[PDB]
Amino acid sequence: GDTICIGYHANNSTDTVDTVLEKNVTVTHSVNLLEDSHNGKLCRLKGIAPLQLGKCNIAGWLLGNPECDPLLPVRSWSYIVETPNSENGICYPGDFIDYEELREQLSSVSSFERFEIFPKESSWPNHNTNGVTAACSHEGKSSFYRNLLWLTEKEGSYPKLKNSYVNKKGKEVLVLWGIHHPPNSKEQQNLYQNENAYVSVVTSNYNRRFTPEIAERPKVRDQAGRMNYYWTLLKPGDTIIFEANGNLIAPMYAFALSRGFGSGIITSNASMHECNTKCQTPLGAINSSLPYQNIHPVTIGECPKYVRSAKLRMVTGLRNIPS
């Protein structure tokens, strides 16, 4: 006699999912929720190219180590790229004070203007400005930081100097300077003429006095002396005053900072291409609306949530039984 049967779809699908009761269940239809695919390139983020420090690290860039290709006088970026072999860093040995805090500050910076805060040929009368060192060599010749100036005695005297800059940029100004610690008392007299020198730096919300410490240190990059590096953010409208009678590595160039959201510092071996993404990782850019990814825990922009999972596939169709 006539018949009617009730049944369900099957097809040639080989997709599998797991359930609580059962593993490796073949299903007719499913959806991947775990993004694993990237293009292996550095791209722009929402229109803005990243800042590539190249041979420099943050310390090398801001001090202006001569080995690093000079960047434009004005730049903007969506994120900051260092490389794993950042060999050009601090070139003259010593301590960089609050380096990690300065990096954290830079992570919310969207642009800078590099400008001459203290013009070399005017800023420091009756002092030598030609001081160089083999620790910061460029083109085989002894050189020095592009953003600092080694002040030393002139004609056998180091007069007390006092200089201030007034921040009329309408943005925070990052000022960097150094304090030199000769290995012995004879170098101190030769360089600065005054055994009991001091340095002071003052703003509305910053005050610190620096005194040199003379002692024979182990040779580092062939130097027994040391150079400590300090920084402050000069608020819009505020004044910075430098007072010193020796051992001052004076600021020459400073940076007018603009704040952004969604920036950060990453380390990457990848190369810049002419591409654009909403999500950048150190391995490559992700172009995905998927909720999860197993590519990298470091993300810039609007990214899927990073997880350790090897597979996340949700069944939509039915248990596939084409037999």
Partner: protein, 171 residues
Amino acid sequence: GLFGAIAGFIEGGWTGMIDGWYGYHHQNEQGSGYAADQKSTQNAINGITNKVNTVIEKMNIQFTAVGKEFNKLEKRMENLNKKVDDGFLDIWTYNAELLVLLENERTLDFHDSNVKNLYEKVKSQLKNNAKEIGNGCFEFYHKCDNECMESVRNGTYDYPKYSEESKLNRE
């Protein structure tokens, strides 16, 4: 499955039925063919589409999350930062895997329920004008042309119309 229809009393699927998840195969004098049930299929697609969208919707966009650096005298803070990062990653991985396993189980059960409900709906329409012959099939005690087949498929089957002929055939 949980409702005993899929991989149960209905052993296998139909590769021949390409227009929906659930439906009908008929055999009568006029010939044979498959037709998907659009109502039960569309409802199922809407549910599963809502379920997938809900899972995606709950995972908010990840915004910039990058490493921090600590000097040789901030080892505790470094380990704290690592503890926090590792802790959150452990939780999200746990949450993601468990949600997918549970929803997968619920999805397979949902399809099984939908198939059993379609069979019982047909069973209750036909009543004793047909016999259950296993494997989710009914054999009519009366002649059932393509119009008759459409009335069952679209839920308007007329029991009294064939009740006499069926009774005669059932003897």
